[model samples]
Target: NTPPELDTVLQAPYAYNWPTSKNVKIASRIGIPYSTFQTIQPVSDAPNNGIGQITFNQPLGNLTGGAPRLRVSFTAEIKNILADSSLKDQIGLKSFPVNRSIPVAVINMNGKTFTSYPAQLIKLHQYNADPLELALLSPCSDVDEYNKIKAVSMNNPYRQGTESTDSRMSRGLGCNYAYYIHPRAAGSTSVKIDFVVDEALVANPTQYKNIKDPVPFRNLNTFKVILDGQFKPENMIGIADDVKLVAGKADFEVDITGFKINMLVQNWVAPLEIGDIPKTIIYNTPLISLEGNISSMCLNTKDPYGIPGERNKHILTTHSMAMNNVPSMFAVMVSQETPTKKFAPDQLAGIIGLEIKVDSDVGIFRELEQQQLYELSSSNGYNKRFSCFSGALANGLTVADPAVAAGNKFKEAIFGAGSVIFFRPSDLGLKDYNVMANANKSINMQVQATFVTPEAAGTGAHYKLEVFSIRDNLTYSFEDGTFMDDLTLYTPDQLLRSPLKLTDDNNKLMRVMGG
Candidate 1:
C-alpha cells in the first residue's frame, strides 16, 4: 500500500461570562472640615472620556487666612476606648462626652487630600472604654488641628549654641519637650480626642521649635604622670648586634647590637606583650640569671680493656659545653688503680669539673675558700649540712655510674653508648662556689666503674672492667691560716658510712698507711 497521512489539532475549552457584583453608595453629605478642604484641589476636568483630570493649579492656603474651614464627619466603629483615656484628655476631649477632636497633619496632592497623625498619640487614646465614641467625636480632618497644635507646642524660648549660666539646665530646648493638640466634634454623644505627637517633628524646626547643641564640662582633678626607677634596665642579655641605647631628654637612640640575636630592654609593666612599642621609653632592672658567662663542662675517659689505669694511663677528652661557668683554675683527680702486680686500688676514678654559675662572683676563689671554712665550722652542729652532703653524693653517683658503666661495657663501639655528663652547679647549692665544690665532691665520692668477663677477641683473660670508688675527704684553707675537713669512710665490702671531720685544724691529722 502506498501510504496514508493524518493531521491532528488540540484546543482549550472556551470560558463563558462570570458574574461579579459590588455595592457602592454615594453619600449625599460628606461633612469635611476646613482643614480637609484646604488640602483638596478641585479637578480641572470632570468625566472627560470616562475619566477625570487632576491638576495642582491652586496655591497652598495659609493657616491664619481665616478661610471657611471644612472637616469630615464620619461614624467609625471602635472596639476599645478605655485604654486610651489620657489621649482623649490631651486632644481636648472627654472619654464619655458626645464629641472629640483628633489632631492631624494634611497634605494636598492631585485633587486628593493625604493625612498623617502621631502613632504615640493614637496609641494613648485608642484603648478607651468607648472607642467608637472617641472615633465618632474626634476630628476626622488631619490638617486643621495639626496647624493649631504645632503653633502652641513649638514656641521655644531657648536658642541653639547659647551658653547657659545655670549648671542644672541644658544649653537649649530639646525637641522631646514639644506636644500636639486636637479638636473634638460635638455631635457624637460619647466623644474623645486623639492627639498624636509626631516624632518627625524633631527634625523640623517649624514643627518642633527648640533644638540646640550639648554643653562641655571641665575636669576637676589634676592628672599627673608618675615614673619609677624600678622600670629601668640595669642588665640585659642576648642583645641583638644592631641594637644600642643612647641617652637624651625623653629621647633615646637604640643602637642595633647584632642580628640573629634578640635584644630585650626592660619596659614598663603597661607594655608586656612582645612587639609592643610604646610612645615613651621606660627602663627596669634586667634579670641577672639570664646574663653573663654561663658555662658547662663534660668529661669522657676510655679504658681499653675495661681495666683501671694500670701501667697504661687512661686518655680523657674534656669537652666544654659553656665557657661562662668555668673557673680560672680547676683540678681533676683520677682515683683508678696504679698497677703494682699485686693488690688493686679503687676500681673507679673520680673526675671533678669546677665552674662559676654567676658572672658577678667570678675570679673570687679566695673569698670562696674563706666561706668554705665558715661552712665547715657551721657543719659541726648542723644536721642540714650532713643531709645536703649525702644528697649531693647520691646525685653525683647516679650520674657517674651510668656513664662509667657505658664506657666500661664499650657499648659505643658497637651499639654506641656514648657516655655523657651533666654538671649543673645550681642543683648543688645557692652560691656558685659552694655549688661547684659540692658538685666536685659528689663526682669524686659517688661515681664508680665495674668490670666483667670479655667474650670476644680474647681467651683466658679478664677483659671486662668498671670504675668503683667512694668519697674520701674534702678540705679547704682560709685566709686566716685555718683549715676545715670533711671525711667519709668506705668499707672493703662496698659499704658507705656517715662522714666525719675535725672542726678545728689542730684536731685534724693525716693518717699514712705505713704509720
Candidate 2:
C-alpha cells in the first residue's frame, strides 16, 4: 500500500553522453515511498512448495500518471523468531523434527571446501545443510568428470538444482535490489506510461513475512522481465530453476558431485520408555550406498535431439555396500547387460545378482518389509547398452562393439539404468529413525568419459575413462565440528575471512587448503 502523503516526483533529464542522445526526461509522478512493496504471495495454494512468485495488478504512474524510475527492494522478512521460550511442559522445537537443512557434511575438492549439495557458487560453508535424506557426491573438478556423471545420474536432482539456498528462504527473492525497467511512452517527458513493481515483491503476505533474519539487500539482480508494462507478470522460471542445476545446451547429465545426509537432533529423545531423556546425541549408524546408473529412459548418443526412451536393466552397474563402514558386505563389478542365451560383455560382467530374501523371516509388516534383492538382474530391464571402462565388460578398445550374434559379449550390451529415491516420512517427526539406511557412501563411482560430451557424441570407441580414486580424501563430516553448535562451526574459509576470498576455491584460492 503506497502512502497518500508519499507521492513524490523526480527530474530525469539527461544531457551529454548518458545513453547520450536522450530519449526523454525522467519526469516525476505519484510517488511510492521507498518502502512501498506488494504483499508477496506464492503463485500456488500449497504453503511449503519451493515456489516463489507474485501476481497482482501492475501499478504504474507517469508524469501525468507514471512515476520516475522507482526504487524498490524486492526482499523477504524471514522468521528468525525466538523458539527459546516454548517448552513449559511440552516438547520443544527440537523434538518437532521435520525435513530441514542441517549443515552436516564437508569436503575439499582440488583444495577447496564445499558442503553437501552437488555444487555451490558462493563461499565455503561452515554450516552446509540439506532437508532431503538423499545427497549426491560426484567429484567433477572439470567438464569431463561432469559428463561421466550424467550418463547415469537419472537426471540428477541436485546440481541442476536442490531445495536449499544458503539455507535462505523466499528462495527467489533472497535479495534487495532488482533493476526492472518499465518503459514509459516514447519521448514524452511530461509522461504517457508509468510502471509499478507491485509491492508484493517485498511486503510478503504469507508465514514467510515472519522475519527475524532477513539478509541485508544488495545490488540489483539482473532483471528477469517478470512483470511487463502490460501489467501481468510471466510465470517465473527464476525461483523455480534457481534451486536447480542446468547448462546452455540439452538436459545436463546432473553430476551429483557428491552426496550427503545431515541433521542436528535432541540427544536420545525417548518417550515414556526412558528413565531420563537424553539431552543431545549424535546418533551414529553406518550404512552406505553409492551407485551411478544409466537408468533414466533417456540416452541418444546419436541424435541432434537428446532423448532416450529405453529403460535398459543391464548396463554399467556397480554398487558398493559397506556395513558399519568397515567392510561387512561389499559388491563392485564392471559389466554390460546381456541376454541369457549369449555371452555379450554384459553377460561376462555386471552387478552381483544376489536373490536372498529376508521378508518372510522378519514375519511382520508383511506388505512393506522392503524385500531385499541382493542380486542384479541378468536380463529384465530397459535393455540398453551399459558398461564400464568405455561401455563394456572388456573395454571397447578390443571389441570395438564388434557385432556378434544374440548371445555375444558387447552385442546388445547393457548401457545405463534408472530412478532417484527420496526419503519422505509421514509424520515428519522421528527421533530414532534410521537415517543410515540411505546414507551416501559413493556406491556409484564417477568415471570421466568423452563419448558423453556434445562435441564427441558418437558410438565409436570415442570415449574417455577417468578413474574413481578420490574418496579417501573426502569426508563424511569434516573433523572437529560434527556436533558443534551452528554458531561455532565456522568453515576454515569463514574463519579466515575476517573477509572472504573474492576468487573461488579450486580456482586460485590461496589458503583454502590450509591457513
Candidate 3:
C-alpha cells in the first residue's frame, strides 16, 4: 500500500501592524522689548562760505556699569547714510584720481587739544549690501581744544574745509559710534568735538542729551525675550518668537515654553502549536497429513524371482486409509535383502529378494489406492551378476555353495551356502533355482523372477508412522510414496547421484550395491 501525498494551502494578504509614536519636548520664549533713537543738526559759519560748528553732540551711556578694570573702547554708526550731506563728496575723496589720503582735527570740550586719525572704511551689517560704515579716532584730552578747532574750520579763508576737494576730510555720514570705557575713565565722562575743516571747529550745535528714549528694563533673574521679530518658519508660513538674551559671562539659566503635539501607532500578531503522526502492520500459512497401507507389490520385468535373471520387476498395491488422500504420483525401489549373496552359491555373494517400499508425503495420497511398480535391469548377464556377487562376497556372505565345497566349510565361514539359499525364488513364492549348485560347473546361470499382485493383506498403513527415529517425523500414506523421488532430501553435493552399499564394522565401505 502507498502513503498519501500531503498538500498545504496558504492564505493570501498576510498583514501585520506595529506600534509607533513621537516622543520629543520643545520649549521657547516669545516677544520682548527694547529702545532705539538718533540725533542730528547744523552749526556755525566760516570765512570760505563753509558752515561750521561751536558744539556737536552724540549720545553717550555707560554700557559696563563699572566692574573692576577692563580695556575700554567704543564704536560709532551713522544710521542715515543717505541724509548726511557731508558724505556725498567726502566718502570717495581717498579713492579719487587726485588724492589718496584725507586729514581731520579733534578738539576736547574739557580744554584738551588733539588731532583725529584719518577715517577708515568699515561695514556695519553682515549682509554685503547693508551699507558702508566709516570711523575716526579722537586724539585730544581737553574739551576746550575741541571747541577752538571747531571755530577755525568755520572761519578758514577760502573755506578750504567746505570745498569738495578730493583731498579734504569730512565727518562720516550716518554712523553708529561705540567707546571702550578704560579703567582710568571708568567713572569719568570726557567730551571731545570733531573738526575736519582748517584750524578745527565744532560742526554742530546740538547737545548729546537731546536724543533720548524710554529705558528698557529686563529681569535678569527671569527668562526674558531679548530679540523678537518675524522669521520664515516654512516656505508658506512666518513665525515670531522671543529671543532670550544671555550674559557673556558664564553660569546663567532661562525658562522656555511652547505648543504641544503627540503621535501613536499599532499592530497584530499570530500564535503557533504542536501535533502527532500516523502508523501501519503485516502475518505466514500451515500443512496437512494423510494415511494408507501397501496392498500389493511387483517388479518392473516378468518372472523377476524365477531365475534371478538380468531383469527383475515388482508391483505393490496401496490403499489410502484416509479420504481424499490419493497420491498424485508414485515410485518404488528394492532394498537389498539380508544374506543376499547366498542365492548365487557358486559365485561369491549377491543380492537376494528385493524389498518393496513406497516414498512420498501422506497428505498427497488423499482417499486413493495406488499401485507402485519398479524394474531392475542388469546391463550384463552372468558377468554383471558375478560382479554384484563378487562385491558382496568380498564383504563375506552366509550361503551354501560349492565355492565353500562342504556344508561344514560353509558353517565355519562367515559366508556359507545357507546365506545364498534364503534369496532363492522359492522363498518369495517364485520358481526355485540353485545358483550355488550351478557355480560348481563351468556354465553360468541367469535367474529372473517377479513378485506379482502384492495384496494389502495387513492392516492399512498409518501416515503418522515415524519414517526415521528422529523427533520430527515426515508422515506418508501408501499411495503418497510415489512422489518420494521428487522430495527434497538434504544430501551434500559430494553424495548426490552415488550408490548405497554396506560398509565394514570399522565404518568403511566394503562394496557398492548398485552403480
Candidate 4:
C-alpha cells in the first residue's frame, strides 16, 4: 500500500535523511536524483567504474522468500559546477563555483524525499557562519586596508569564461599569473584577509555579518584561494602588496578532515530491530599535509583588473586533506577501485564489526585552520560590535581597535583579507590523513518500483518481487545480482505514445572508445 508517482512518494517533508522511525524506505535510500540510466564515475579520472541497475525479480529483504520482491540501484555523483553566484560570471567558470559549497547529503525513500544531513558534515561550515570567536585569516594582512575597498560581487569583467562577482579581481576566484603588478603600487602583490569574533554576519555599519561559504578558508598552493568579503580593488591600488602562502609567513592550509556518510536499512519485517540492519557507512579521511604558491597574481598591466591564467598557466600546485568532520556534501569520490590517482583519499574499509565498517581518522589530526583564534570574551573587540547597548555607547568599554579592545594585549595585529582564512598540514599541531580505493561508491540511486499484475495505470505501486539487481560488468549493483535500468520507459503510465524519449531504432548505434 503506497503511492505511485515518484514525486508523491517523496512528498513527506524531511524524508531524505537518516530516518526517524529507524526503518528506511528505498525512496529514502537513494539520496539524490539520478537519470533512469546513465554511466557514473566516482572521480573525474577513475577506472573501476560499474554499470547497470538490474536483476529484478528477487525476494524482499527480511521477507520469507515471499511474493514481495524489489529491485533497485543507488546511482549518484558529485561534480564541480559553476556555482550560482558572481564567481560564475567572474571567471567564466564553465567548471566549478567560486562560492563553493561543502558536501551535502541526504537519504530519501525512493528518490523524491531528501534531508541535508547530520553534524560532522557541515559543522565547520556552521561555525564559520556563526561561531563566537574565530582566528580566521586571508592572504592579505592589512586590517586598515579592508575598511577602504568597495568591490561589487557581480558581472564586471577580468574573469575566465563567466561574468564576475565582487566586481572583478580575477572575479574573486584568484589568478595565478595575475600579472603580479599593481598599476599604482607597482611590484607589491597583495592578498587580504579578515579575523573577527562571532556575529555570523560580517561587521556591518549598515546590517549584520552573515557569510555562506564552506571552502572560504583554503590554502592557496593547495586548495585554490578564494577572496572573501566586500572591498573594491581600486581602494587597495596603492597600499596592498605581495601576499604569500608559505610556512612561518602566510601559512594557511585549508582542506577536508573527515567525511562520514552512512547508509542503512531494515527491510526484514518480522519485528525487525531496525538498528539490526547494516549501517553501510561511506567514510574516508584525506590525510593531506602540504603547501602551495604562485609567482604573483598581479594586475594584468593592460586590463588592470582582469582574469589571470586558469591553472599552472601563470603558476600553482597543492593538496593535503584531513577528516573528522563532514563525511559528505557532494565530495566527489573516485571509482572505489583507485583512490590514489582519483581525488586522493582512503579506500573502503574491512568490516570493523557486525554490519559495521569505518574508514577514516578518529579525531587526532583535526585542527582549526584559522591563523590565530582570539577567544570570545565580553570585553573583546567583537563584543563591541554586538551593539548589546546602543550605537555610540554600545559596550561602555568599547574600543574600535581589535587589539586595544582585547584590553589584555596591544601592538594590534592589523591583518586579514575579505574575511577569508586558510589552513594546511605543515603546522606542528595540524592533523594528517591517508588515502584509499575507487572500487566502490556511496553516492548511488536505489530504486524500488513495485509491479502488480494489473500494474494498473494508476494503482498503488509499493514493494513487489519479480525484480532484483544483477551486478555485472555493465550493471554496478551494490549486491552481486542487482538490476537497474530506465524502467520509466515502461508503458505502465499509459500516458504514452511517450512524449519524452521517443525511441528511434535507428538511434541505436554501436560505439566504443578504443582502449
lDDT of 1 by residue, 134-203 (tens): 2222322111101011111221112111322321121122211221223334332222212221111110
Better of 2 and 4 by lDDT: 2
Candidate 2 lDDT by residue in tens digits, 1-515: 97577666876765643653465467655422333332322123321221222222222211010111111222121111122321111100110011111112232222223333211110011011121211111011001111122112232212221322321111111121122222333332211111112111111000111122111111111111121111111111111111112224322121111111111111111224335423342212112233232321223354211232221222332232222211112222222222221101111121222121121222111122111111111111111122221221222332234464433433223332211011211111223232111222212222211122111133222111111110111112222222221211223233334565566667452323211
A best-first ranking of the candidates according to their lDDT comes to: 1, 2, 4, 3
List, residue by residue over 1-515, the lDDT tens digit for candidate 4: 99676543435556466666677545433221122222212212111111111111112233121011111111112112112212122111110111111122221211222222111222223222222222121111111111111223122223332333322233222431121111222232222221111111111000111122111111111111011211111111121111222334332221211111111111223323334422221111111111111121211122101111210111111122222221111111001122121221111111001110123323221232112211211111222121111101111222244446443221121111111111111111212221111112221111111100101112211211111111111111122222222111112233223265444445454322100
lDDT of 3 by residue, 319-429 (tens): 322222112111121222221121111111122333322222222212211111101221111111222221222122323344654434322232111111111111222
Q: After superposition, how far is residue 97 of candidate 1 from its true place, in Å?
A: 99
lDDT (C-alpha, whole model) for all candidates: 0.22, 0.20, 0.19, 0.19
Cα lDDT for residue 45, candidate 3: 19
In candidate 2, stretches whose alpha carbon ends up further than 4 angstroms from where it belongs are: 1-314, 325-418, 422-515
TM-score of each: 0.12, 0.20, 0.13, 0.16
Best by lDDT: 1
Where in model 1 is the C-alpha error above 4 Å?
1-417, 428-515
Q: State residue 321's C-alpha deviation in candidate 3, in Å.
A: 5.9
Ranking by TM-score: 2, 4, 3, 1
Candidate 3 to truth, TM: 0.13
